[PDB]
Design an enzyme around this catalytic site. Structure first.
Site, PDB file in Angstrom:
ATOM      1  N   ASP A   1     -39.938  24.468 -15.067  1.00 31.48           N
ATOM      2  CA  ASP A   1     -39.695  26.041 -14.722  1.00 31.48           C
ATOM      3  C   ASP A   1     -39.303  26.229 -13.398  1.00 31.48           C
ATOM      4  O   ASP A   1     -39.687  26.319 -12.473  1.00 31.48           O
ATOM      5  CB  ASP A   1     -40.861  26.910 -15.009  1.00 31.48           C
ATOM      6  CG  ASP A   1     -40.599  28.144 -15.083  1.00 31.48           C
ATOM      7  OD1 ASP A   1     -39.580  28.718 -14.748  1.00 31.48           O
ATOM      8  OD2 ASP A   1     -41.631  28.851 -15.370  1.00 31.48           O
ATOM      9  N   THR A   2     -37.765  26.292 -13.172  1.00 34.98           N
ATOM     10  CA  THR A   2     -37.122  26.541 -11.866  1.00 34.98           C
ATOM     11  C   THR A   2     -37.381  27.968 -11.342  1.00 34.98           C
ATOM     12  O   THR A   2     -37.022  28.329 -10.151  1.00 34.98           O
ATOM     13  CB  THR A   2     -35.642  26.359 -11.800  1.00 34.98           C
ATOM     14  OG1 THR A   2     -34.882  27.358 -12.795  1.00 34.98           O
ATOM     15  CG2 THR A   2     -35.121  24.877 -12.290  1.00 34.98           C
ATOM     16  N   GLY A   3     -37.903  28.852 -12.086  1.00 40.64           N
ATOM     17  CA  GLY A   3     -38.322  30.429 -11.993  1.00 40.64           C
ATOM     18  C   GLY A   3     -39.736  30.270 -11.254  1.00 40.64           C
ATOM     19  O   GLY A   3     -40.164  31.374 -10.933  1.00 40.64           O
TER      20      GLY A   3
HETATM   21  C1  LIG Z   1     -42.681  30.465 -18.903  1.00 42.77           C
HETATM   22  C2  LIG Z   1     -43.602  31.851 -18.930  1.00 42.77           C
HETATM   23  C3  LIG Z   1     -43.607  32.088 -20.460  1.00 42.77           C
HETATM   24  C4  LIG Z   1     -44.048  32.255 -17.796  1.00 42.77           C
HETATM   25  C5  LIG Z   1     -43.610  31.782 -16.314  1.00 42.77           C
HETATM   26  N1  LIG Z   1     -43.109  33.002 -15.440  1.00 42.77           N
HETATM   27  C6  LIG Z   1     -41.679  33.097 -15.148  1.00 42.77           C
HETATM   28  C7  LIG Z   1     -41.310  32.097 -14.366  1.00 42.77           C
HETATM   29  N2  LIG Z   1     -40.075  31.447 -14.950  1.00 42.77           N
HETATM   30  C8  LIG Z   1     -40.042  32.247 -16.437  1.00 42.77           C
HETATM   31  C9  LIG Z   1     -40.819  33.416 -16.287  1.00 42.77           C
HETATM   32  N3  LIG Z   1     -40.178  34.900 -16.106  1.00 42.77           N
HETATM   33  C10 LIG Z   1     -39.159  35.096 -15.182  1.00 42.77           C
HETATM   34  C11 LIG Z   1     -39.499  35.795 -14.017  1.00 42.77           C
HETATM   35  C12 LIG Z   1     -39.900  35.694 -12.783  1.00 42.77           C
HETATM   36  C13 LIG Z   1     -39.783  34.432 -12.204  1.00 42.77           C
HETATM   37  C14 LIG Z   1     -40.296  36.491 -11.576  1.00 42.77           C
HETATM   38  S1  LIG Z   1     -40.858  35.944 -16.972  1.00 42.77           S
HETATM   39  O1  LIG Z   1     -40.075  37.139 -16.503  1.00 42.77           O
HETATM   40  O2  LIG Z   1     -42.080  35.884 -17.201  1.00 42.77           O
HETATM   41  C15 LIG Z   1     -40.117  35.816 -18.670  1.00 42.77           C
HETATM   42  C16 LIG Z   1     -41.193  35.854 -19.800  1.00 42.77           C
HETATM   43  C17 LIG Z   1     -40.348  35.713 -21.102  1.00 42.77           C
HETATM   44  C18 LIG Z   1     -39.231  35.484 -21.459  1.00 42.77           C
HETATM   45  C19 LIG Z   1     -38.712  35.259 -22.628  1.00 42.77           C
HETATM   46  N4  LIG Z   1     -39.424  35.323 -23.671  1.00 42.77           N
HETATM   47  O3  LIG Z   1     -37.199  34.873 -22.668  1.00 42.77           O
HETATM   48  C20 LIG Z   1     -38.415  35.421 -20.268  1.00 42.77           C
HETATM   49  C21 LIG Z   1     -38.842  35.622 -18.887  1.00 42.77           C
HETATM   50  S2  LIG Z   1     -44.278  33.814 -14.553  1.00 42.77           S
HETATM   51  O4  LIG Z   1     -43.724  34.961 -14.114  1.00 42.77           O
HETATM   52  O5  LIG Z   1     -45.374  34.086 -15.594  1.00 42.77           O
HETATM   53  C22 LIG Z   1     -44.700  33.082 -13.225  1.00 42.77           C
HETATM   54  C23 LIG Z   1     -44.789  33.518 -12.145  1.00 42.77           C
HETATM   55  C24 LIG Z   1     -45.354  32.897 -11.003  1.00 42.77           C
HETATM   56  C25 LIG Z   1     -45.447  31.290 -11.036  1.00 42.77           C
HETATM   57  C26 LIG Z   1     -45.592  30.554  -9.579  1.00 42.77           C
HETATM   58  N5  LIG Z   1     -46.128  31.368  -8.561  1.00 42.77           N
HETATM   59  O6  LIG Z   1     -45.196  29.642  -9.625  1.00 42.77           O
HETATM   60  C27 LIG Z   1     -45.250  30.829 -12.027  1.00 42.77           C
HETATM   61  C28 LIG Z   1     -44.666  31.716 -13.211  1.00 42.77           C
END
Ligand SMILES: CC(C)=CCN([C@H]1CNC[C@@H]1N(CC=C(C)C)S(=O)(=O)c1ccc(C(N)=O)cc1)S(=O)(=O)c1ccc(C(N)=O)cc1
Ligand SMILES: [Cl-]
Ligand SMILES: [Cl-]
EC number: 3.4.23.16
Lengths: 99, 99
Positions: free
Chosen positions: A25-27
């Site tokens: 997860d690059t996010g």
């Molecule tokens: C894969 C997942 C389900 C959640 C992971 N998260 C986002 C990081 N990448 C993916 C994920 N998201 C991107 C948002 C940010 C990076 C702020 S999100 O908004 O929750 C999302 C949820 C659903 C979808 C979909 N269904 O298409 C798309 C996107 S998170 O915001 O909980 C998260 C936040 C913080 C960390 C950290 N501190 O290391 C780690 C994760």
């Protein structure tokens, strides 16, 4: 390896002698795994998503192997929707995005 | 280009020709944009992350240009602090994970 994104980039990790599946997860700034016991010291930490923060346990300097590549670093343990390998360890194994 | 992960993979995107910062997020199945006034009808959707779920507006067949690469697909609009480009569009620009 080169990994495409047509499906979720889930890979096998080995941590604590256990094999698990985790999402690259690059996010994610950090690496967060589901509840498990890890050896050594830990401390409470809060990390947050779009609608609020959750509590995790922080374990530092933990050996973890990701798709065969070794990393030693911080792993958070807590109620994550899925095991996530974030940039703290992606950087360690030499991961980049390319197009 | 090659996008490093030493920092968040933030790049310039264009929507309606308007330039914005966005995070290339291999952990996101779909693309999530900050609140903006896209025209036309949308479908209510819930998406979940750490913390829980937030309500978004799904728009279909939306053009986003990502560092000069045009992708067209679903985007989800909601109160995120940062635009997130998910796999649905990353695949269209030929983006991979490499290590
Ligand atoms: C894969 C997942 C389900 C959640 C992971 N998260 C986002 C990081 N990448 C993916 C994920 N998201 C991107 C948002 C940010 C990076 C702020 S999100 O908004 O929750 C999302 C949820 C659903 C979808 C979909 N269904 O298409 C798309 C996107 S998170 O915001 O909980 C998260 C936040 C913080 C960390 C950290 N501190 O290391 C780690 C994760
Ligand atoms: Cl670390
Ligand atoms: Cl799409």
């Amino acid at each position: 390896p080169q990994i495409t994104l047509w499906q979720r980039p889930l890979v096998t990790i080995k941590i604590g002698g256990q094999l698990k599946e985790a999402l690259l997860d690059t996010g994610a700034d950090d690496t967060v795994l589901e509840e498990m016991s890890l050896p050594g010291r830990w401390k409470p930490k809060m990390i947050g998503g779009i609608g609020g923060f959750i509590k995790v346990r922080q374990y530092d300097q933990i050996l973890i192997e990701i798709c065969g590549h070794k990393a030693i670093g911080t792993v958070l343990v807590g109620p994550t929707p899925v095991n996530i390998i974030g940039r703290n360890l992606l950087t360690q194994i030499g991961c980049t995005l390319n197009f």
